Amino acid sequence: DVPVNLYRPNAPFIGKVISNEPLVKEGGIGIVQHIKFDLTGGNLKYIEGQSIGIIPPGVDKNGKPEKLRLYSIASTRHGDDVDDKTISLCVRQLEYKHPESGETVYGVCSTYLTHIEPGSEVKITGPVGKEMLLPDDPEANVIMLATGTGIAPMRTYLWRMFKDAERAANPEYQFKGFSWLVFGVPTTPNILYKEELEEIQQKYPDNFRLTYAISREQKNPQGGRMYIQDRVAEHADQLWQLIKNQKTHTYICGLRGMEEGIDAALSAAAAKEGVTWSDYQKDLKKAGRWHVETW
Ligand SMILES: Cc1cc2nc3c(=O)[nH]c(=O)nc-3n(C[C@H](O)[C@H](O)[C@H](O)COP(=O)(O)OP(=O)(O)OC[C@H]3O[C@@H](n4cnc5c(N)ncnc54)[C@H](O)[C@@H]3O)c2cc1C
Known part of the structure; x- marks a missing residue:
């Protein structure tokens, strides 16, 4: 309930x-x-x-x-x-x-x-809210695409998944799947919860991957500032492969408009296997495995 x-x-x-x-x-x-x-x-x-x-x-x-x-x-x-x-x-x-x-x-x-x-x-x-809920399945994969304060729900998922005190308190949820956070902010000082996120990746290298898109410190292959959509395009094939798993859930949170570039990148990856991302995505949304919340 x-x-x-x-x-x-x-x-x-x-x-x-x-x-x-x-x-x-x-x-x-x-x-x-x-x-x-x-x-x-x-x-x-x-x-x-x-x-x-x-x-x-x-x-x-x-x-x-x-x-x-x-x-x-x-x-x-x-x-x-x-x-x-x-x-x-x-x-x-x-x-x-x-x-x-x-x-x-x-x-x-x-x-x-x-x-x-x-x-x-x-x-x-x-x-x-019931559209950004985490699955109870400890074997599920969780892709987290965030910008700015969109990191908020991701922190709730990651803490429950990897904090020692949380694991001790949640005997029914011992995460064993794979989580990947792609976080986009303008500078390193703007990486919210940097220290803790990096501590989690160090302790669980096989269960958590952390990727940053720092606009004022990195450039994409085209020479422009690095944004989350650029990182998604960079790892589009891997992300698409993870998304094909029946147990994978994806969460998009943060700046309104961050969805467009992400869809374009995944669409190009899916097209290579004869799949129309927009349609596949619709089914994912209906199945409750594609979560979006932006503002
Ligand atoms: C589901 C949900 C979750 C949210 N989560 C968070 C969160 O975790 N953290 C967070 O910080 N916020 C979050 N927000 C946003 C939050 O609800 C507020 O909208 C935000 O804090 C701004 O409210 P405010 O009262 O400070 O601004 P307000 O006094 O309400 O002013 C907002 C108004 O300013 C104007 N405006 C805003 N930007 C511009 C601009 N660039 N140019 C011209 N005019 C502009 C618009 O008319 C807008 O209606 C979330 C929103 C939703 C819907």
Whole structure:
């Protein structure tokens, strides 16, 4: 039984911030924070791949109360401390420039969150979502294609799969399949959770492969900046081969529009064996083995 909407916008759970730490190292672009909330006092439960809503304080330009913003859960069902008492988010502060203005605009909910102080009460809703769930089969293969904060659900899968404390807590899920994360960010300092991701690959070289697409530090064969679609094209045949397995699941998460280049690359690979990717993909989606969530 997948937990869903234990709390709703009309009566959200009031959680308390425990910690708020920077994920972007010096020399990186933008601000992305790892924020953990205390769930004690309530009955909010969740599983990997889901999201929760956050209702920021204040009113919008029209004087109306701000609505909730959804955020991908970044922690396993047990929380970062494996105590079933918390939940974490991976939040980027939205920033952009206005047309012919010159001044930076800051997102309401993301700025509120990235600068929130420990001890502060936060309105939480959810959890929600059933399209990014991880299979219970410990023999399944999991391809993870992420950009930016799209790394959030991937962290929940990878932690449950490879963290010592998680394995000790989940006797029913001892991952033995193969997982491959292709992560695209602009700089090395922007590689969210770099240290831990690399520790996992070192400990499980036969069960986890980590591939980076660093735009400001790498160039693709055509001379352009390296993006995730370039890495997918680079390993298109291998990825297609893994995708043909009845037990393989693929997850796409992050920047809206990242799907197009990925499909073009896989389409070229599948075509070599007389397969139309777009059609094969449709069946995968219907079977619940092709998961996508972008924003
Ligand atoms: C399922 C789901 C999961 C999500 N997961 C995450 C996550 O894990 N981490 C995360 O950081 N975010 C995530 N998001 C995005 C999140 O919900 C918010 O939309 C985001 O934080 C921005 O909200 P805000 O309140 O800060 O911005 P707002 O104050 O709501 O401003 C947003 C508005 O700014 C304008 N705008 C935005 N960009 C530009 C631009 N480039 N040029 C001109 N105008 C622009 C648009 O009109 C837009 O509607 C997720 C969204 C969904 C739907």
